[PDB]
Write a protein that binds this ligand. Structure first.
Ligand SMILES: [Mg+2]
Ligand SMILES: [Zn+2]
Ligand SMILES: [Zn+2]
Lengths: 1358, 79, 99, 98
RNA sequence: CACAUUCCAACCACACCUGGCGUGUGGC
DNA sequence: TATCCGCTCACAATGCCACACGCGCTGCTCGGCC
DNA sequence: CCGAGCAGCTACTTGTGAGCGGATA
């Protein structure tokens, strides 16, 4: 119906036009009579008739006098619904300011009037004058004064000098302010000045002035002269029991405001003293700006119960405003709620529903069907029959739910599967029967969980629920391609028992014709369930075409597998059943079934699987007992050996040989080894003692213990759980996070000691409270992520670009964390994938990577691939389908319209319930040092050096003169398998391209020594090194030869600051060595804290550590990789010590020492040094004054910052780092997430941009303009001969992206309501509601789902 | 009855246009007063619409052609 | 009188007992809270108050705690725990001589 | 507990909840996110205003359903108009275009 | 002359209710 | 006078459900159209 | 009279981000 929404300021004339009257009496209603007042807060002639088609005086009450007003009260007789929109006003006597524009931080007036907010507040609260219309006076026109500064200066000028002390003063200042003149003056000032903070203030002021002059607003409207009022019925006021009425806080606010206004009018009429009227004006200002936003001024006044009062701003902000409570999520009709219950008989596509619930939900459909047949002629008869619930209504209820699905919903909703569609079947009861195979996706246990049910109610809705939200249409999770219908513990335990074959049982060695005969023989009891029998199977194999070739063959399998074969469809082979059929086994079986046979038979296959599993687990009789859990007989001797070891360790400690730390470490490792040994013993015990004679002596087999069947099959029990159960619990934790030296030498089956149980519960309460605290942070993160999301949909089919990202399997740390396949599966290649064979186009561009495609790619041994990405897509206000990839829930390419952002945010926030908040895992919780630089290798390969800069020593090894050097292992096929960071001065015992085996160390480095190793042999001298000025002599004691110490910039006086100690590699003649290739003198300028043990004039070696500069290594820096880690990563917050990079290349030097901190200068050979920087004097310097490094290289060793990464490495490096970090954090826990989600998240995260040079564009250089907008403007300018612009992408934290959006309603729905509302109002912004959330807040179709096409049809109209 | 709609996704380009044309067919069958081209088995309008779509004789182009034809018939009768 | 009445009727600690079984009565009268005046708020509590200390041995139960919004803030007194004259938690112990 | 059509709040024409009063359930914000992650544009559009907020839409939908007409009318959410009037009560002017 | 309506055997219209907001407790 | 640093203020922290409960008193002073 | 407006009888969070001096070269 209507187009975009426009927001701007409210002119007083506009308010008066809105007003249908003025409230003057502060009374609402009367005590004896409930009729409203004449012109009070609740009026009739101002707002409307309190009753329908009935006036206040009762004169015009018929339906024929409607449309006219009365002669005494003058109330237009109409419906009371008109009271929902009619408003009045209050004529304020002393114009006041708006607390929103005054407490915005930064406030609008504080920046517009170039006046500090402190002085404006002083003027507003009537305690200091401000002058106006200076002119010929000596004072400045905008200067402020106090009472004394006014009384002493009044005698100088009293006719032309005037200074008001109210909001009228700033109102007149606004009215007496020019727009074009000030704009031109500030533009000239910005063009003439050269500063950073001043230029930022000037550009903010000029942007503010441009927003004023461009939009249809006027500054003087900020001073509220008339006050709009809230319609009466919208004001909460209802007759409570008795004379008291339930009122609202806004009622009291308006009451007090009207009272203070009337008192001020009375005081002005009697010509009260100046102090009295100024105090009354201050009180009226307090009243009005508490009505606007109570508590913002500082004093949160209370009305009743001594509680903070509710103002108008409170009704919008927070989790209780209109946006969060009444606009985004509203309560719906035709809904119900009930506790869940296991339904084991219903099919996967359907569900159960209580009879009374189904009756109460579908009352209109029942009424319609009763009126259809000759059963009920009116609605009253049908209602009475439904209330009576005769025998004639139940069949109607069964008919209306014949094919009418409903929606089941879990209370905490994480991903798309939080709401599913199901066909209901009526059941007698008060509980909702649910399918067992979907609750796992619901994450809903049956311990008392309550879920909700909703009705589609519309043909379109029913068809959508049957087509999209149905359970059958959702079998792959949107996060990972893994099927979310993986079987649960009961069915998998039943199947494992059915397939776990023994050695001897009833009917071992016989022959069976088919699976039906096997089932007959089993149910007859003449044979067992699991026994090796030779049967004949008749399997079917899918040929190249749609043919199913049949082959009959004699197999030797267990009776259980043969019986279960009657369930699997014909397409699958027999090798998938001829297994133990564990959890992973049945999961891969279902996956292969869905892959080969599609979706239609997979549903019934899973249903039959679940049915047979339940039936055979019931028939089996699986049960855990006391005798089932066995204790290892040799556990006692292991415990005694462990206690003897700890006793001898304590004896050694008492002997004074070993200290406390090493004693604790030895005790901990001894107990860990003992626990591992006893766990292995328990496992090998639980596996043995299962011997059965089959015409022999002993045929030891797989153990048939029930607890082992439950654990090994992966149904419910894991290895660690059964270890804690049967074996010793092991070690526990103390409050700080350390490990107590006294372990728990008992188990659960055996009696647990009191102190042991106390330590156990102390350790467990931490993990228990962990999730209870972390659920709130996870919900907050999900909300932030979805608010950043939902601003993009698939609006194009192709962008027409070729840029992407170089995806490669990460191999950092161990061998490999994940291959390339899973990182490219479901995507489209940008360029031609180059096989190791030169000039190969085996994978053409613009092609989707299917299963066979990635299989062939892995077969061809491809190391990396340039794959299309979302950050590279050029689609405006959305993304294209040709850049996202597969849907991850459908077996085809992504369609057009589906909101990728919402599903991405959901898939990212779902594992939040499985992450951690805080733990002792701080990276080096055990030990970490640079002495670990002894790098070994597992497999055999050739060595490859990245960033090659190294030389060879006289000892036979290779020394590295750089830090960015990287060691890689090329395998026999050509790919990389091992990657490691080569430290500075590593002892590379190998060479580049050399074939080395696995299991040997190739390099190593000193832990606490920064090497200044040379490059070529020569003679060393004390060049530019004078004793007593730059160095000191601290003699050694145990080394014979003493060490020359160098002081740092903290202890060295000013006498040696201009002298830097250096080392000059000279020859015997006197001339220094020349670096081979260049024409630069070879010298090493050593910084402070240098320990030079080498003498003078001695023949130095090629690459020998001369000055042993001690580093600050030995501490941990791995910030806890929990939910706070990913929160801070997405928020793009800077770490405590940000690892600074190199802005420009070239040499570096130190200039002005102690300019508050250390200084640095970067001078390249190409350009100048236009950028200075401050560096703390407590951070070590990796690069020295003589070393030349490329831009973007680390200087301060520590955690990096994403801002510098993006601004010095491009758009692809920063997103690669982000995705790698977040995937590592998620895989540390064990949860898998496709990279497309985080990719689109970061793409949305860098939506903003800035300008460097305006050029021919209309955007100023100091304006943070949107990326796609300036991009399309640059495109338009490229269509002509003018230069577009100089755009620079800047990264911000996720909370800032939801605010710096062209749509203001989308930001108003988020936090920070008042500031964004004021910013949109002052600029007269108008948003085209182009998105999803705004389309909800307005309440229309969404341009993402089935209605997206509708929106397209709306775009073709205009 | 109907349990899966994968074959419909095979026959139509995607799921959104599929559900749109199914809703159009359901509106034509329920309130439009049109007869189902496939004999029903005590099923609602949605199920028979999905079945007739799966049989391949009804889609968006066919529905537009039928709408144009009924319009032409209206005008021919108005003569 | 009004102050005493409002303290006994409406406060963060005055609450009607969960009269459903004697166990709830006993565990509610022996209930120690960290909320209310002079105490923390469950919204602004760190991981230190929630965790149980080895000094809680015999003075407050470490396994009885309402799981949810307040884990560790609401506890129950130990069986043999007594209130010290100064207002501390005292635990009985048998004196052990040489033999 | 369940509800077909009961009372509505006075501040805004929205269905109540709870079991004491004959009210439905609350379509939480996470539920809206999950719905818009799927398609079901018409489903959300009816669940938001036609079933909950439309002062003149829910009655029309009920009259159509009891008359065997499964067709809806979007209308406008009442709470949206409440927010409009609340922002208009402040010194800020919001306005819908053509 | 003209505009516009016109107030009374069953009954259609004259129906039915507190999450204002906070706190406390408990459960998932 | 630029510019980093220290102090100060705005804003943020699930979701549902169930139950229970609640709203400064008395007095004084000024003002309104059957 | 009635009604309505007003007067005497809080600090274990922590974090993050932005703004306002502020003092030092
Ligand atoms: Mg549960
Ligand atoms: Zn009247
Ligand atoms: Zn693209």
């Amino acid at each position: 119906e209507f187009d975009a929404i426009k927001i701007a300021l409210a002119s007083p004339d506009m308010i008066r036009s809105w007003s249908f009257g003025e409230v003057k009496k502060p009374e609402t209603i009367n005590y004896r009579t409930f009729k409203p007042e004449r012109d009070g807060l609740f009026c009739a002639r101002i707002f409307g008739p309190v009753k329908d088609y009935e006036c206040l005086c009762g004169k015009y009450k018929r339906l024929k006098h409607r449309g006219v007003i009365c002669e005494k009260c003058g109330v237009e007789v109409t419906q009371t619904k008109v009271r929902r929109e009619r408003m009045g006003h209050i004529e304020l006597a002393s114009p006041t300011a708006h607390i929103w524009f005054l407490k915005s931080l930064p406030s609008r007036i504080g920046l517009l009037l170039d006046m500090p907010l402190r002085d404006i507040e002083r003027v507003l609260y009537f305690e200091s004058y401000v002058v106006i219309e200076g002119g010929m006076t000596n004072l400045e026109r905008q200067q402020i004064l106090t009472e004394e500064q006014y009384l002493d200066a009044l005698e100088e000028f009293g006719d032309e000098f005037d200074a008001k002390m109210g909001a009228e003063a700033i109102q007149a200042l606004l009215k007496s302010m020019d727009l074009e003149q000030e704009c031109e003056q500030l533009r000239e000032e910005l063009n003439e000045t050269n500063s950073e903070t001043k230029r930022k203030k000037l550009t903010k002021r000029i942007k503010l002035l441009e927003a004023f002059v461009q939009s249809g607003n006027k500054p003087e409207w900020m001073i509220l002269t008339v006050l709009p009022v809230l319609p009466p019925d919208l004001r909460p006021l209802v007759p409570l029991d008795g004379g008291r009425f339930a009122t609202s806080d806004l009622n009291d606010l308006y009451r007090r405001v009207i009272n203070r206004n009337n008192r001020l009018k009375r005081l002005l009429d009697l010509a009260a003293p100046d102090i009295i009227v100024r105090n009354e004006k201050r009180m009226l200002q307090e009243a009005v700006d508490a009505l606007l936003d109570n508590g913002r001024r500082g004093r949160a006044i209370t009305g009743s119960n001594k509680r903070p009062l509710k103002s108008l701003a409170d009704m919008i902000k927070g989790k209780q405003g209109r946006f969060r409570q009444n606009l985004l999520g509203k309560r719906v009709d035709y809904s119900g709620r009930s506790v869940i219950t296991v339904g084991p008989y219903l099919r996967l596509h359907q569900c159960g529903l209580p009879k009374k619930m189904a009756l109460e939900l579908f009352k209109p459909f029942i009424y319609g069907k009763l009126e259809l047949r000759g059963l009920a002629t009116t609605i009253k008869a049908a209602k009475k029959m439904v209330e009576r619930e005769e025998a004639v209504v139940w069949d109607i209820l069964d008919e209306v739910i014949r094919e009418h699905p409903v929606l089941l919903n879990r209370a905490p909703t994480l991903h798309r599967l939080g709401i599913q569609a199901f066909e209901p079947v009526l059941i007698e009861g008060k509980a909702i029967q649910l399918h067992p195979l979907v609750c796992a996706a619901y994450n809903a246990d049956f311990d008392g969980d309550q879920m909700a049910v909703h009705v589609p109610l519309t043909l379109e809705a029913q068809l959508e629920a049957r087509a999209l939200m149905m359970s059958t249409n959702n079998i792959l999770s949107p996060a990972n391609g893994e099927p979310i219908i993986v079987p649960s513990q009961d069915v998998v335990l039943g199947l494992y028992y059915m397939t776990r074959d023994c050695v001897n049982a009833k009917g071992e060695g016989m022959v069976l014709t088919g699976p039906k005969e096997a089932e007959r023989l089993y149910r007859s009891g003449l044979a067992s369930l699991h026994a090796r029998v030779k049967v004949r199977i008749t399997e079917y194999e899918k040929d190249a075409n749609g043919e199913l070739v049949a082959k009959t063959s004699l197999k030797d399998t267990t009776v259980g597998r043969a019986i279960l074969w009657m369930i699997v469809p014909k397409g699958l082979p027999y090798s998938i059943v001829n297994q133990a059929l564990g959890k992973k086994a049945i999961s891969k079986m279902l996956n292969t079934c869905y892959r080969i046979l599609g979706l239609k038979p997979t549903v019934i296959f899973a249903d039959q699987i679940m049915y047979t599993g339940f039936a055979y687990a019931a028939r089996s009789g699986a049960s855990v007992g006391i005798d089932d859990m066995v204790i290892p007989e040799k556990k006692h001797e292991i415990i005694s050996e462990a206690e003897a070891e700890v006793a001898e360790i304590q004896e050694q400690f008492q002997s004074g040989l070993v200290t406390a730390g090493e004693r604790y470490n030895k005790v901990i490792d001894i107990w860990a080894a003992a626990n591992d040994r006893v766990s292995k013993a328990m496992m090998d015990n639980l596996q043995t003692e299962t011997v059965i004679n089959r015409d022999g002596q002993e045929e030891k087999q797989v153990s048939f213990n029930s607890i082992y069947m439950m654990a090994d099959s992966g149904a419910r029990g894991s290895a660690a759980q059964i270890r804690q159960l049967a074996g010793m619990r092991g070690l526990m934790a103390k409050p700080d996070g350390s490990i107590i030296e006294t372990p728990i030498t008992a188990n659960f089956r055996e009696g647990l000691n009191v102190l042991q149980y106390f330590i156990s519960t102390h350790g467990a309460r931490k993990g228990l409270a962990d999730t209870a605290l972390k659920t709130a942070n996870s919900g907050y993160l999900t909300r932030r992520l979805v608010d950043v999301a939902q601003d993009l949909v698939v609006t194009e089919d192709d962008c027409g670009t070729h840029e992407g990202i170089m995806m490669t399997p990460v191999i950092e740390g161990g061998d490999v964390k994940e291959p390339l396949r899973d990182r490219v599966l479901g995507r489209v290649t940008a360029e031609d994938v180059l096989k190791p064979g030169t000039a190969d186009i085996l994978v053409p561009r613009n092609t989707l990577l299917h299963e066979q495609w990635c299989d062939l790619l892995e077969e061809n041994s491809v190391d990396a691939v340039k794959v299309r990405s979302v950050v590279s897509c050029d689609t405006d206000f959305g993304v294209c389908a040709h850049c996202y990839g597969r849907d991850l829930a459908r077996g085809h390419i992504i369609n057009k319209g589906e909101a990728i952002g919402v599903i991405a945010a959901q898939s990212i926030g779902e594992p939040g319930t499985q992450l951690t908040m805080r733990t002792f895992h701080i990276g080096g919780a055990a030990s970490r040092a640079a002495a670990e630089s002894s790098i070994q290798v597992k497999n055999k390969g050739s060595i490859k050096l990245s960033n090659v800069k190294s030389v060879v020593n006289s000892s036979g090894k290779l020394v590295i003169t750089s830090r960015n050097t990287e060691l890689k292992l090329i395998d026999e096929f050509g790919r990389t398998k091992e990657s490691y960071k080569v430290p500075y001065g590593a002892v590379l015992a190998k060479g580049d391209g050399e074939q080395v085996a696995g299991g040997e160390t190739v390099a190593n480095w000193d832990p606490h020594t920064m090497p200044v190793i040379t490059e070529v042999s020569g003679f060393v001298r004390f060049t530019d090194m004078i004793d007593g000025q730059t160095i000191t002599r601290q003699t050694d004691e145990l080394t014979g030869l003493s060490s020359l110490v160098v002081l740092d910039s903290a202890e060295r006086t000013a006498g040696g600051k201009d002298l830097r100690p250096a080392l000059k590699i000279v020859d015997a003649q006197g001339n220094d060595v020349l670096i081979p290739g260049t024409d630069m003198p070879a010298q090493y300028f050593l910084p402070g804290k240098a320990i030079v043990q080498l003498e003078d004039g001695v023949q130095i070696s090629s690459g020998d550590t001369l000055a042993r500069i001690p580093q600050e290594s030995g501490g941990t820096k791995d910030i806890t990789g929990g939910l706070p880690r990913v929160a801070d990563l997405f928020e793009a917050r800077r770490p405590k010590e940000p690892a600074i990079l190199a802005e420009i290349s070239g040499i570096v030097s130190f200039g002005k020492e102690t300019k508050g901190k250390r200084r640095l200068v970067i001078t390249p050979v190409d350009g100048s040094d236009p950028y200075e920087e401050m560096i703390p004097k407590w951070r070590q310097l990796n690069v020295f004054e003589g070393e030349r490094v490329e831009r973007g290289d680390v200087i301060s060793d520590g955690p990096e910052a994403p801002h510098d990464i993006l601004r010095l490495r491009g758009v692809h490096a920063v997103t690669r780092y982000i995705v790698n970090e977040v995937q590592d954090v998620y895989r540390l826990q064990g949860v898998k997430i496709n990279d497309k989600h985080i990719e689109v998240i970061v793409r949305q995260m860098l939506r903003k941009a800035t300008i460097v040079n305006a050029g021919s564009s209309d955007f100023l250089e100091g304006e943070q303009v949107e990326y796609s907008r300036v991009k399309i403007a640059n495109r338009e300018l490229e269509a002509n001969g003018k230069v577009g612009a100089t755009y620079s992408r800047d990264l911000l934290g996720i909370t800032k992206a939801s605010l710096a959006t062209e749509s203001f309603i989308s930001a108003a729905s988020f936090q920070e309501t008042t500031r964004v509302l004021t910013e949109a109002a002052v600029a007269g912004k108008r948003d085209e509601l182009r998105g999803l959330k705004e389309n909800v807040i307005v309440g229309r179709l969404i341009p993402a789902g089935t209605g997206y096409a509708y929106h397209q049809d709306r775009m073709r109209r205009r | 009855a109907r349990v899966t709609v994968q074959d419909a996704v095979e026959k139509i380009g995607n799921r959104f246009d599929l559900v749109l044309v199914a809703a159009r067919r359901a509106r034509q069958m329920q309130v439009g007063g049109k007869d189902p081209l496939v004999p029903e088995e005590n099923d609602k309008t949605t199920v028979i619409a999905l079945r007739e779509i799966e049989e391949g004789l009804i889609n968006n182009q066919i529905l537009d052609v039928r709408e144009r034809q009924e319009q032409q018939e209206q005008e021919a009768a108005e003569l | 009188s009004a102050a005493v009445k409002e303290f006994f009727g409406s406060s963060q600690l005055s609450q009607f007992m969960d009269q459903n079984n004697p166990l709830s009565e006993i565990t509610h009268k022996r209930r120690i809270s960290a909320l209310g005046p002079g105490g923390l708020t469950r919204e602004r509590a760190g991981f230190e108050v929630r965790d149980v200390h080895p000094t809680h041995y015999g003075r407050v139960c470490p396994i009885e705690t309402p799981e949810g919004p307040n884990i560790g803030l609401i506890n129950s007194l130990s069986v043999y725990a007594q209130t010290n004259e100064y207002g501390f938690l005292e635990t009985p112990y048998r004196k052990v001589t040489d033999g | 507990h369940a509800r077909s059509t009961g009372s509505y709040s006075l501040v805004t024409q929205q269905p109540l909840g709870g079991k004491a009063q004959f009210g439905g359930q609350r379509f939480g914000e996470m539920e809206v996110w999950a719905l818009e992650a799927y398609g079901a544009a018409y489903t959300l559009q009816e669940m938001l205003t036609v079933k909950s907020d439309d002062v003149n839409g829910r009655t029309k939908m009920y009259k159509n359903i009891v008359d065997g007409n499964h067709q809806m009318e979007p209308g406008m959410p009442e709470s949206f108009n409440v927010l409009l009037k609340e922002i208009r009560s402040l010194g800020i002017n919001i306005e819908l275009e053509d």
